[PDB]
Amino acid sequence: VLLPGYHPFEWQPPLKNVSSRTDVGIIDGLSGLASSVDEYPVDTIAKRFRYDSALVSALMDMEEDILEGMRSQDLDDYLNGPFTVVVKESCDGMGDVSEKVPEKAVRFSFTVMRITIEHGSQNVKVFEEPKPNSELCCKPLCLMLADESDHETLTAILSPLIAEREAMKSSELTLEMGGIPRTFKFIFRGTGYDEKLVREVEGLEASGSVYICTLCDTTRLEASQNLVFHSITRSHAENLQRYEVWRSNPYHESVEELRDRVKGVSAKPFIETVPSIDALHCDIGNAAEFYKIFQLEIGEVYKHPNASKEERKRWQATLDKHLRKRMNLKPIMRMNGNFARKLMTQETVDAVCELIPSEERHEALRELM
Amino acid sequence: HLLSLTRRAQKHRLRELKIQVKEFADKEEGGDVKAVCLTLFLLALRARNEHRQADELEAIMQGRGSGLQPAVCLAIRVNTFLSCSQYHKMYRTVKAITGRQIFQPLHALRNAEKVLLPGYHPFEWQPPLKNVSSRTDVGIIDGLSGLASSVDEYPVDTIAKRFRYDSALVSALMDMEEDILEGMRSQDLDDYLNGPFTVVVKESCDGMGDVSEKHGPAVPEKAVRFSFTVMRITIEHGSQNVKVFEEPKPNSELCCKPLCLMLADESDHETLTAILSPLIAEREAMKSSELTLEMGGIPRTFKFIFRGTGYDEKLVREVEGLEASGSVYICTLCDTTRLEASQNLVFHSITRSHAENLQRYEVWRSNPYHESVEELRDRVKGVSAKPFIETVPSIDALHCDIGNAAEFYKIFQLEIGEVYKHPNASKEERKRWQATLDKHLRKRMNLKPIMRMNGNFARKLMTQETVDAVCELIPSEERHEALRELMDLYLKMKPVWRSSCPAKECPESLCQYSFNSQRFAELLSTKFKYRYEGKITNYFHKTLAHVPEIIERDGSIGAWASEGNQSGNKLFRRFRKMNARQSKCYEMEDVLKHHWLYTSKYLQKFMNAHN
Amino acid sequence: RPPSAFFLFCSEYRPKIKGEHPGLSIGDVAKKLGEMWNNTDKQPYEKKAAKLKEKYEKDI
DNA sequence: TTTTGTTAAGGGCTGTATCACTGTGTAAGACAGGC
DNA sequence: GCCTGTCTTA
DNA sequence: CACAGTGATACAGCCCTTAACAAAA
DNA sequence: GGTTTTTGTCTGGCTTCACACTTGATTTGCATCACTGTGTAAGACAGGCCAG
DNA sequence: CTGGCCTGTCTTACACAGTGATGCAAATCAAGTGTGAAGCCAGACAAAAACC
């Protein structure tokens, strides 16, 4: 009952290139990939659900929460008007899985984030997940023993799921809950992708690129000088066309001109993502900048443009020692969230000002913090 | 449907039958409508094959409460490897959903652990043990036994934990109390009798190979397990020794009570002796005293007999001062050399002993007749280091079969090549002989060829049927007769080393074993002269020379086998992963206490309740 | 289980408090018993309690 | 007069004994350095 | 007329 | 290699269910 | 329309639990401890394409 | 023929998962019994409802 493939459902109109059989459960993740000795060598084993069948099972799992939420919003149990389901889509490699050679694994998964029902012309929410980032609600869709940097195998295994999701993007799901047929339409948001996997599936270059942002076309130099006035520009379709421009070289440009034209899209994208940021990384980036500013204000780097490596090293040692003395902060080789959390305080700024001669710069550091 | 409608409605739809039933009850059952309807519904439930709901109704009407004693909760937790967190989740869930407290909470299980662990019951030794404390509340003790750890001293690189040997003996006895009382009952003896019991304790010790957990650059981590197994308990009732207890599965990991667990190499002699010497000292001390302990209200007295048979050859040789296995002195029971043992096949006797070996080390050390190293080594028969554990080396039923089969296989290959008639043969000729034999066994006997000796190849090959098969490939039939008689002698010998009690099961086989091994070796020496190279294995040497003496010493062979402890490592690792605090000092004692509990016969009784 | 010292005391003093006041409620009777026993002499109760305790301990 | 056993053929739940299948520990030989 | 780890697989 | 130990699976044993006598109590 | 059902109505006198109150010694609930191994990812680094 | 300088491996830092133990607060138990709250009974019968 609790596994995909048990309940019946319908798609109106029927999904494009997806079977209409509803009794389908676990299916081979290779999706009929050829395995003969002549073909490309298949080094992976994977198993998956059909994406729609999984969506069905997940909604039926939460049936009770949906009905009780409808009650809690002073709505009727039997209402069936179009429910809209928001679905966070997620993907990550899982490192070494081996039991003991490294054996890597990819996990493609989804999370039901919010279910709204339409009464008249208000969209009243009937459910939303309390813990969106918990392992508990991250419904697994496909599990494979492959490297997330094994682009050929990754695309071969994940493309059928993307096809199915594309198909559901323009169809309605009819599904019986509590005796009443209900209707659901879905919104897929692939926000669960860390940067490396975003860049891989959206055709962009590797993280060391000059095109540092996956939301915009800025270069490292541009983003360093301009800093704040930037806007979200990139989209999956713009990236597919920038790949086609790279591929076709329509204006007969050199490789550097072409790269500047396509702003890093040298490979063809195959997953539409919603690249976001982690609150953790905001804190970490800010804290790293503040750490560098503190050590440089201690060494007073504006007065010493030609300062050597060892002088800056002693500046850093001074800051470490005094932060240990005053804030009980163990010096760090690498940056983490707890360090950022304890360092980004106004009292820490007072502690570091205790080592800065000019108080005019105390003003500036304190306003910055 | 009836169950769709409401109580007023169902009463309407059933009023007629209700009146008829009230009539039947008043006329036949004294007006008990409740009981009659209950019985009708129970029997209807049984009719539709739905026994489960009927039994649950029966239990709720009887009101018989379902509550597991904390000891049973411990039995399940221990025997299914649940951590505390996982057990707690299951407990709280069942209690919340059934409203009833079927499983007990974690503190109740800890308390029930205390009873089953060493250090709980009181006891006395008469007279008090030499150099052993009289405190009875000792549990897990540090395995280094106060070994110096300062930076000046020898570096201590191992973590170990142990029980006090007497204390562990007390805990084990109290564990088997119910079996002892039931065994006296089954022998027509009294529960309250207290006359001196005798405990035959089998001692064991083995390395557990690798124990590492690793994410490659695998740093190995070896372990040593020092254990004991209560083999039988007897009671003196007359001039007779009545067997009130005998371990049914003596090689099982279930009854191999762990006494000391250490993370150290069995080949690391300095640490092996530092960790084990205190155990040996308590064991010695107990050899000279009687244990009084209260069981079922009656004080009883126990006399112990320690027999160190759980040592494989490598560890025997290490702790008894002998040379490494590649030596010319191949037997750990006698002084024979490999050459001597190959020429003299059957006539050897069990002459080594812990005392002789201590003596020979002293002879080696003092060199009292000012001899050269070859002469000195000859004099002391390879005892070139001081022994430190008294053992009782034996053989397992497996290796007898293995050695015999290896010899018969080689004989088969050579008889196919008629080496009795042709002395020389190239490598190709012998390879084709072996190919012929392997093909023919695969064809007529369905026997897969093997590149490595093993037990069940021996078991399947040592049959008269295989001899008929191989005779289909031999020209002369005088050699058919020879092979049939050699295999007949093998089959006349095998029951002695395989049976569980050869004195009772095959008394004629045991009585004629020595005569049959003599004829066996004489047949090999006359009609099989070619298979003499001055080489022979310890297994074959022990099989032909020491089987009757070992039987007369122990009563049996197959029960003092080396077979079971291959599970131990697995067991160990499991406990280290899922039931152990992740800190070097604590993980060891958590593994020890869990292994102790896993061996207790009390909880195993709960886990076999259905039978 | 064996009763607390106070509990065996309460069982023995039920008839006294009952004979003096017959209609006293369970709340009232127990409130009294607890109050006057709390104000108290009571060592033999603790003795009997310890004895019954170890007696029950023995019971397996 | 009131409780149970019993026959025979035969119909579902339940309990355990395997399936197939691979990782893995242990050990049986092979083999090579003692510059 | 060698000893003794390491390695290979069964 | 042998075997441990997985989830799935096949097979055997379980108490009955029709009428009637009737044995123990 | 007739012919079938569900589901109420009115009492009380019944039977079966829960609560009431106290004391203090157990038993449970629950959060916490100290502690390392392991995964993850922030670093550093040698490396090789190519120009003066 | 040798840099700087734009790139995939390497190397540990570091959070934290989760082990059995721990420790303190809070139920809990156990006895006495008299209440009050609660669903149920019986019989003639009519509402609000679906069946030919």
Ligand SMILES: [Mn+2]
């Ligand atoms: Mn990732």
Ligand SMILES: [Mn+2]
């Ligand atoms: Mn061993």
Ligand SMILES: [Zn+2]
């Ligand atoms: Zn940007």
Ligand SMILES: [Zn+2]
């Ligand atoms: Zn011998």
